From Swiss-Prot:
Disruption phenotype: Dwarf, twisted leaves and enhanced disease resistance in cv. Columbia when grown at 22 degrees Celsius. No visible phenotype when grown at 28 degrees Celsius, or in cv. Landsberg erecta, cv. No-0, and cv. Wassilewskija at any temperature. Humidity and temperature sensitive lesion mimic phenotype, accelerated hypersensitive response (HR) and increased disease resistance. Bon1 and bon2 double mutants, as well as bon1 and bon3 double mutants are seedling-lethal when grown at 22 degrees Celsius. bon1, bon2 and bon3 triple mutant is seedling-lethal at any temperature. This is Protein BONZAI 1. The keyword Metal-binding applies. The lineage of its organism: Eukaryota, Viridiplantae, Streptophyta, Embryophyta, Tracheophyta. It is found in: Cell membrane. Changing G334A: Loss of function and reduced interaction with BAP1. PROSITE patterns: C2, VWFA. It comes from the Eukaryota. Overexpression of BON1 has no effects on pathogen resistance. GO terms for molecular function: calcium-dependent phospholipid binding; metal ion binding. The gene is BON1. InterPro entries: C2_dom, C2_domain_sf, C2B_Copine, Copine, Copine_C, VWF_A, vWFA_dom_sf. It is a lipid-anchor.
C-alpha cells in the first residue's frame, strides 16, 4: 500500500493505546451462588425439615421478581443445596437480592420444585443483601440471619436460622482466546507493489454491516506476515461455533484500505486448523454473489484459551475501590438559601443535583471500601475570614479530608454550605493534585487501594491547562476521575477531557497520559432516578482499574 513509515508507526501507536484501554475487553462476569443453612426453625424447635431457598431480585420501587429456586433438600437439620444460582454481575448497579427459605410440606416429597406453590409451604424466614456485599468478602461467604415480620420488635425479634451464601466467579466467563495469525503469499490489489497488511475479525450480522471485534497492527512490506497476538472472548464472537469474518487488508495512509482476502470460519474451526497445522485459502468477492479462491493462505500459529485476571479476581486479592468527592462551591450555584440554588437544601427532604450525584455514585462505590473513609473536598469558596480556597475539607478540619461513609459526605456537605461564602473562580487543579497526593502516598506505602474521585460542577473551569497537566501526572497513579456537570450551563469545553468524546491528553511539557482516567457527563437534571446517566460512567471503572494494574511498574 501507499504510506510512510511514520504513518504506519502512528496508526499502530493509536491501536496499542486503544487495546490497553479496552483491555481484554468483553468478558461480562457471571457469579455462581451456592447455598446452605443451619438452625432452621419455625418456632423454638430444631427438627428435620424439607428446606428450599427462593431468591428474588428487588427493584428500586421495592417490587420482587423470582429469579432462582433451589431443589428441596429432604429430611434435613442442615441443608447443603446442590443447585447453584448463576447471576450476571453488573458493577455499575446495586444488585439487591432477597432470600426466602421455606419448609416444604412432606406431601410434596416427590414433586419437582418448579411445581411448588409457596403459599402451601411453611415460610421460615427472609434476608436481604446486595450481590456486591457477598463478592467483596475475603472468604466470599456471607451468613445472613433469617427474620420474619412477627408484628413489630427490632430487639425481641426471634431468629429462624442462618443462610450461608458462597459466591464464585464462573470459570467460563473468565475465558479469552489468544490467537496468533499468519499469512502466506498475500497479493495487494495495487499491482507491482508489496502489501502492508493487517487483519480485522468481525462478528456477523444478518443483512447489515459486520461489527469489528478485533484488529492487528500493520506490518510494512510483508507478503508472509506473522502478527502479534489478538485476544477474543466468547461474547465478542457469540459462541465458539459461530462463524466470524477474517479480512486481510492493505493499509493506505489515506484511510481507504483495500481488501486482500477474506475467510469465514468459527473459532472452533480455527482451533482445528491450529492443531492440524493446516492453512485455509482466502477469497475475494467477484460477480454479485460468487467468490474467487486465492493462492494466499491464513494459518493459526497459536491458539490458547486463558483464564484472564478479572476485576473480581483483584477484589479477591484484597484490592479496594475508595470513593472521593470534590464539590463546586462557587457563587454561580446561587446562594444556598434560595429555592432555585443548585445547592438548595429542600426542607421536605428532596435531594438537590449535587446530592443526587453523590448518592448515585457513592451508593455503588461504598461497597468496595471496607473502612468507608471518604476524602471530601469543596472548591471555590471563602471560609470564615480566610481567602478563597480551591481545596478545603468539607468536614471543616485542617488536617484531614476523610469523613465516615456516604452519610458523612452528606452531612459535611450541608454543614459546609452554611459555613462558607460561595466565591470563584472554578478550578479543578488543586483538588486533582490533592487526590493525586493521596493516591501517590497509597502507592508508595504499597497499599491496594484504587481511588475514584467524583468532581461535581456547574460551570467550566478556568485552569484548563494546569488541569490537563495534573491529569497527565495522575494517570500513573491508582486514580480514576468522574466529572458531573449540573444545571443548564454549556459544558462543550468539558468534552475535551472525556475518555470517549475527547482525545489522549497532552501535558504542557509535551508528555502524554499513560491511560485515560477521566470521564465527563452532564447530569441533564430532568432525571428523577430513572435513566441514571451516572451508571454508564461507573461501567467503565473496572476497565480503568485493570488498565492501571496492567501498566503499573
Amino acid at each position: 500500500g501507499t504510506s510512510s513509515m511514520a504513518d504506519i508507526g502512528s496508526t499502530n501507536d493509536a491501536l496499542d493505546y486503544y487495546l490497553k484501554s479496552k483491555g481484554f475487553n468483553g468478558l461480562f462476569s457471571q457469579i455462581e451462588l451456592s447455598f446452605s443453612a443451619s438452625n432452621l426453625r419455625d418456632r423454638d424447635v430444631l427438627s428435620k425439615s424439607d428446606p428450599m431457598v427462593v431468591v428474588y431480585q428487588k427493584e428500586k420501587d421495592a417490587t420482587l421478581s423470582e429469579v432462582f429456586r433451589s431443589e428441596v433438600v429432604l429430611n434435613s437439620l442442615a441443608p447443603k443445596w446442590i443447585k447453584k444460582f448463576i447471576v450476571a454481575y453488573h458493577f455499575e448497579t446495586v444488585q439487591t437480592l432477597v432470600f426466602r427459605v421455606y419448609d416444604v410440606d412432606t406431601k410434596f416429597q416427590n414433586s419437582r420444585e418448579e411445581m411448588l406453590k409457596l403459599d402451601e409451604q411453611q415460610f421460615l424466614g427472609e434476608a436481604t443483601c446486595a450481590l456486591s456485599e457477598i463478592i467483596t468478602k475475603s472468604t466470599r461467604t456471607s451468613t445472613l440471619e433469617l427474620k420474619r415480620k412477627d408484628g413489630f420488635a427490632p430487639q425481641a425479634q426471634p431468629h429462624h436460622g442462618k443462610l450461608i451464601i458462597h459466591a464464585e466467579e464462573s470459570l467460563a466467563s473468565k475465558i479469552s482466546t489468544e490467537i496468533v495469525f499468519r499469512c502466506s503469499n498475500l497479493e495487494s490489489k495495487d499491482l507491482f507493489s508489496k502489501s502492508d497488511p493487517f487483519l480485522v475479525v468481525s462478528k456477523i450480522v444478518e443483512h447489515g454491516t459486520p461489527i469489528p471485534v478485533s484488529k492487528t497492527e500493520v506490518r510494512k512490506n510483508d507478503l508472509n506476515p506473522i502478527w502479534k497476538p489478538v485476544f477474543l472472548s466468547v461474547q465478542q464472537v457469540g459462541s465458539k461455533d459461530s462463524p466470524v469474518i477474517i479480512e486481510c487488508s492493505d493499509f493506505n495512509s489515506n484511510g481507504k484500505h483495500s481488501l486482500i482476502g477474506k475467510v469465514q470460519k468459527s473459532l472452533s474451526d480455527l482451533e482445528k486448523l491450529h492443531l492440524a497445522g493446516q492453512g485455509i485459502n482466502f477469497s475475494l468477492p467477484t460477480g454479485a454473489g460468487q467468490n474467487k479462491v486465492l493462492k494466499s493462505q491464513l494459518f493459526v500459529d497459536k491458539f490458547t484459551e486463558t483464564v484472564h485476571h478479572t476485576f473480581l479476581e483483584y477484589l479477591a486479592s484484597g484490592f479496594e475501590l475508595n470513593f472521593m468527592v470534590a464539590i463546586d462551591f462557587t457563587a454561580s450555584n446561587g446562594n444556598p438559601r434560595l429555592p432555585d440554588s443548585l445547592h438548595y437544601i429542600d426542607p421536605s427532604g428532596r435531594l438537590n443535583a449535587y446530592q443526587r450525584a453523590i448518592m448515585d455514585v457513592g451508593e455503588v462505590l461504598q461497597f468496595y471500601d471496607s473502612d468507608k473513609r471518604f476524602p471530601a473536598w469543596g472548591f471555590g469558596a471563602r471560609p470564615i475570614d480566610a481567602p478563597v480556597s480551591h481545596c478545603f475539607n468539607l468536614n471543616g478540619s485542617s488536617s484531614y479530608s476523610e469523613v465516615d461513609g456516604i452519610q458523612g459526605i452528606m452531612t459535611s456537605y450541608t454543614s459546609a454550605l452554611f459555613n462558607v461564602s460561595l466565591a470563584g473562580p472554578t478550578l479543578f487543579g488543586p483538588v486533582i493534585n490533592a487526590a493525586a497526593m493521596i493516591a501517590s502516598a497509597s502507592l508508595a506505602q504499597g497499599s491496594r487501594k484504587y481511588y475514584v474521585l467524583l468532581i461535581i460542577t456547574d460551570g467550566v473551569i478556568t485552569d484548563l491547562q494546569e488541569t490537563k497537566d495534573a491529569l497527565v501526572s495522575a494517570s500513573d497513579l491508582p486514580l480514576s476521575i468522574l466529572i458531573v456537570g449540573v444545571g443548564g450551563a454549556d459544558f462543550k469545553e468539558m468534552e475535551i477531557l472525556d475518555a470517549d468524546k475527547g482525545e489522549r491528553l497532552e501535558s504542557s511539557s509535551g508528555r502524554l497520559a499513560s491511560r485515560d482516567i477521566v470521564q465527563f457527563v452532564a447530569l441533564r437534571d430532568v432525571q428523577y432516578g430513572e435513566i441514571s446517566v451516572v451508571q454508564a460512567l461507573l461501567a467503565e471503572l473496572p476497565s480503568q482499574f485493570l488498565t492501571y494494574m496492567r501498566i503499573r511498574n
